[PDB]
Amino acid sequence: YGLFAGPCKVINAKDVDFMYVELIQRCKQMFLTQTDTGDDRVYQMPSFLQSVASVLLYLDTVPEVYTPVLEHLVVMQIDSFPQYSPKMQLVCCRAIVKVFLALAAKGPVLRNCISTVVHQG
DNA sequence: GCATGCTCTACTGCTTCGATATCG
DNA sequence: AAGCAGTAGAGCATGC
C-alpha cells in the first residue's frame, strides 16, 4: 500500500490525498483508540510508519488536521522500542529515520514539530 | 502469544566390497 | 548391498 502510493500520483492526483486519510484512519483505530493495552497488533507499526513516510514524500499540500495523529503515533513507536526482538529493532530505527527524513524537506513552517516529537520522546 | 528450550524417531548419506560393463 | 553414524523436522514445556 505505502509503496505503490508513490506511482499512483501520476494516475489520479486525488488518490494520494485519499490515502494518508484512509491510512491514518486505519492507523488510529488500532493502537490509539481501542485496545491500546491488550493487543498484539504491534509487530507491524514499522510497516505502518514506513508506509506513512513513503506516502508523505509524494503528498504535497498537507491537511494540517492529521499532524496531531502523526506526531502522536511516532512517539508511540519511539516508546514501543524494547518490547521487540533483534533484527527488527533495526527495522524500527529505519522507520523512525525515514519519517524524520520525510517531514523535514518541505518547509520550515512545518519542521518546528520535529523539535517537539523528540522532546515528548 | 509469539519466542526460546529439551527431545524422538528416522531419512540421507559415508564407507567398504563385490559384480558388471567398457576399452586398449 | 550391508552396516552405521549423524542431524533435522517435528513434538511438549516454559516464559515478558
UniProtKB/Swiss-Prot annotation:
Question: Which portion of the complete protein is shown here?
Answer: 366 to 486 of 4128
**What name does UniProt use for this protein?**
DNA-dependent protein kinase catalytic subunit
Q: Which residues form the signal peptide?
A: none
* Compartment annotation: Nucleus; Nucleus, Nucleolus; Cytoplasm, Cytosol
Q: Which disease is it linked to?
A: Immunodeficiency 26 with or without neurologic abnormalities: A form of severe combined immunodeficiency characterized by reduced or absent T and B cells, recurrent candidiasis, and lower respiratory tract infections. Some patients show dysmorphic features, severe growth failure, microcephaly, seizures, and impaired neurological functions.
Q: Which top-rank group of organisms is this from?
A: Eukaryota
> What the entry says about post-translational processing?
Autophosphorylated at two clusters, the T2609 cluster and the S2056 cluster. Autophosphorylation induces a conformational change that leads to remodeling of the DNA-PK complex, requisite for efficient end processing and DNA repair. S-nitrosylated by GAPDH.
Q: How does it assemble?
A: DNA-PK is a heterotrimer of PRKDC and the Ku dimer (composed of XRCC6/Ku70 and XRCC5/Ku86). Formation of this complex may be promoted by interaction with ILF3. Component of the core long-range non-homologous end joining (NHEJ) complex (also named DNA-PK complex) composed of PRKDC, LIG4, XRCC4, XRCC6/Ku70, XRCC5/Ku86 and NHEJ1/XLF. Additional component of the NHEJ complex includes PAXX. Following autophosphorylation, PRKDC dissociates from DNA. Interacts with DNA-PKcs-interacting protein (KIP) with the region upstream the kinase domain.
List the coiled-coil residues: none
Q: What does this protein do?
A: Serine/threonine-protein kinase that acts as a molecular sensor for DNA damage. Involved in DNA non-homologous end joining (NHEJ) required for double-strand break (DSB) repair and V(D)J recombination. Must be bound to DNA to express its catalytic properties. Promotes processing of hairpin DNA structures in V(D)J recombination by activation of the hairpin endonuclease artemis (DCLRE1C). Recruited by XRCC5 and XRCC6 to DNA ends and is required to (1) protect and align broken ends of DNA, thereby preventing their degradation, (2) and sequester the DSB for repair by NHEJ.
Q: From which organism does this entry originate?
A: Homo sapiens
Q: Which family does it belong to?
A: Belongs to the PI3/PI4-kinase family.
